[PDB]
Structure 1
Amino acid sequence: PEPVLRKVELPVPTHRRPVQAWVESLRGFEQERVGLADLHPDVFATAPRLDILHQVAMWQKNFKRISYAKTKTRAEVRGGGRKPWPQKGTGRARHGSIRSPLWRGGGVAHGPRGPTSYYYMLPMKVRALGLKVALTVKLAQDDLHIMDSLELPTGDPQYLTELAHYRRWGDSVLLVDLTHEEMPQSIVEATSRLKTFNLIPAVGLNVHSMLKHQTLVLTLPTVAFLEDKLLWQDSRYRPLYPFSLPYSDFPR
């Protein structure tokens, strides 16, 4: 069995050296050490920026939040048009309407006024850096595992559960294949019946999932995809118009 030896495709800074990870397999219980992969140090050995993780984690948690809480003001509560009793003479407190916020059943003075949006956008480069940092942190704390593929001998979830327990993978595992359509049917069958082992395509990777799961599993094709997408942000001009429109060298 020839080792699976992955080299980094994109040029590495001369002053830096690649970091490495065992290439593994899910085809048997002991099929660790199937190879050795170089990883780009700028993606997998960047400065550990936990403050940037918090920035990106909070942007994910909040940027799509729409609040639907709403109260009625004194203007919107039913009725309440007339002055309850004369300004002077009664010996009562003076009141203009029975739906003032002082009255039971009155309006709310400074209540929620939804629907309220919380949309904002961290700069693209910050969002790309948060992805690198999460990857660097997973590797550095021995929570990253590179596989050659996600193929299983069976689609039985207990196997994947037992395999993780044997390899000491933690309670939650995040499986990243390169593409949704081209996922092995076996890993699809196993993870669909599980709650803490979650299968996603490469395009769905994010800081919140990587932090929620203890263990991160990446196929080797995924690694090349990630290095390419994230290192592109380091070398790009400022845009002239949205990157969705045609450029000379983009996409690929």
Structure 2
Amino acid sequence: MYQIPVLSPSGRRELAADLPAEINPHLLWEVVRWQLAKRRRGTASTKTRGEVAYSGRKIWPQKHTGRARHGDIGAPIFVGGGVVFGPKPRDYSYTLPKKVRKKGLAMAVADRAREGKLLLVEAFAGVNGKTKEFLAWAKEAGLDGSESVLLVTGNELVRRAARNLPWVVTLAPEGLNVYDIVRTERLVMDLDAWEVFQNRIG
């Protein structure tokens, strides 16, 4: 809600949040879905009785035949001919109003604050590139591999120091996908984030 923790370079202090702290999950449910369909690459297809290679010639006359009545072999009633109402390729994206994700961005952040599962950072023993130069930072901060974590920073070095971490997924300061936020069971971010997240809302 109002209160948030911070690992300063000089100790452990806090800060006052400017953030609405009500709830509405059918918003998030209606935001996750958007994120997941827009990443859907439109690729599935079958072939209707037109993109089938068989010709367009009656198989045997219907008059005086003994059997039934038929025509070209693209006919779905046959076999191997055409698809019925197959799934030609098509986009799944749309345009969800920004005011749903903006507010949707805030809602989820307080959700970790409301549970305390938050941390702004600024001090790092791992301001350089090494996965070992981080897990001890997590040791001296409070991440013992028990539960998952999302991480944000504007430094492409720390990402390296954890890009191979199964329980820690990289995230740039911008695309705070509500998916990965709710995906991970805990969150971490930096001021380099808390100026754009603020310039979004704050």
TM range (shorter): 0.7 to 0.9
* Alpha-carbon distance, 1:87 to partner: 1.0
| TM-score between both structures, scaled by the size of structure 1 | 0.70
Matches within 5 A, 1:73-152: 73-114=48-89, 116-152=90-126
* CA pair 229-96 structure 1, distance change in 2 beyond 3 A: same
**1:22 equivalent in alignment to 2:5:** yes
* CA pair 122-38 structure 1, distance change in 2 beyond 3 A: same
* Alpha-carbon distance, 1:210 to partner: 0.8
Aligned to 1:5: none
* Alpha-carbon distance, 1:111 to partner: 0.6
1:193 pairs, out of 141, 158, 164, with: 164
Q: Is the 8 A contact 2:126 2:137 kept in 1?
A: no
* CA pair 74-52 structure 1, distance change in 2 beyond 3 A: same
Overall identity of the aligned pairs, in %: 32
**1:65 equivalent in alignment to 2:40:** yes
Name structure 1 gaps, 5 residues minimum. 1-17, 232-252
Aligned to 1:210: 181
Q: Is the 8 A contact 2:4 2:15 kept in 1?
A: yes
Of 149-158 and 67-76, deviating more is 149-158
Name structure 2 gaps, 5 residues minimum. none
C-alpha separation in 1, matches of 2:18 and 2:197: 10
Q: Secondary structure at the match of 1:203?
A: coil
C-alpha separation in 2, matches of 1:225 and 1:153: 21
Q: Is the 8 A contact 2:121 2:189 kept in 1?
A: yes
Q: In the comparison of the two structures, how many residue pairs are matched?
A: 200
Aligned to 1:240: none
Post-superposition Cα deviations, 1:121-178, rounded to whole Å, max 9, x if no partner, equal: 111111111100110111112221121244527744246335546724643322212x
Q: Is the 8 A contact 1:48 1:136 kept in 2?
A: no
C-alpha separation in 1, matches of 2:200 and 2:67: 72
Q: Is the 8 A contact 1:63 1:121 kept in 2?
A: no
| TM-score between both structures, scaled by the size of structure 2 | 0.85
Matches within 5 A, 1:165-176: 167-168=142-143, 170-176=146-152
Post-superposition Cα deviations, 1:75-134, rounded to whole Å, max 9, x if no partner, equal: 2211231111111222211001122101111101111111x1112011111111110011
C-alpha separation in 2, matches of 1:164 and 1:48: 30
* Alpha-carbon distance, 1:201 to partner: 2.6
- Give every structure 1 segment of 4 or more consecutive aligned residues whose post-TM-superposition deviation is greater than 6 Å: none
Q: Secondary structure at the match of 1:222?
A: coil
Instruction: Give the letter aligned to residue 193 of structure 1.
Output: N
Post-superposition Cα deviations, 1:47-77, rounded to whole Å, max 9, x if no partner, equal: 1221111111111001242321111111221
Q: Is the 8 A contact 2:5 2:14 kept in 1?
A: yes
